Design a protein around this ligand. Structure first.
Ligand SMILES: CNC(=O)CN(CC(c1ccccc1)c1ccccc1)C(=O)c1cc(C)c(OC)c(C)c1
Length: 111
């Protein structure tokens, strides 16, 4: 039931990584490469960076006690995007489309 909810969390991440959503999910797959992109203000503005590969690793390493802790990291990832980027940036629209996928699945987690 709590392992089942963490099993459901694995499924949520599988959906977010799936080819169907790749057109808008791709910016969230891996951590922001500060050096490559010259975003030398990112670590000042975003104190707790998060991405889907980091969440996957934490789920695999049992760093989430329950679905609420997993959900908190997914929402941190989206919140960081909304905080750092101008509200009209394409990546903000992409965040909203991927968050739509996450919120619908997370809401329908059996208990
Ligand atoms: C594998 N490479 C990346 O993920 C690059 N990138 C997204 C990138 C972008 C997204 C949408 C349309 C066009 C470009 C980008 C680069 C620089 C600033 C914003 C968006 C990122 O590494 C990335 C960067 C930031 C600041 C992000 O917000 C936290 C995210 C989610 C990804």
């Amino acid at each position: 039931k709590v392992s089942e909810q963490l099993k459901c969390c694995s499924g949520i991440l599988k959906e977010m990584f799936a080819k169907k959503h790749a057109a808008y999910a791709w910016p969230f797959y891996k951590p922001v490469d500060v050096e490559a992109l010259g975003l030398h203000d990112y670590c000042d503005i975003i104190k707790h960076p998060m991405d889907m590969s980091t969440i996957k690793s934490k789920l695999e390493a049992r760093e989430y006690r329950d679905a609420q802790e997993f959900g908190a990291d997914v929402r941190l990832m989206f919140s960081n995007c909304y905080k750092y980027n101008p509200p009209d940036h394409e990546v903000v629209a992409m965040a909203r489309k991927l968050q739509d996928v996450f919120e619908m699945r997370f809401a329908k987690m059996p208990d």
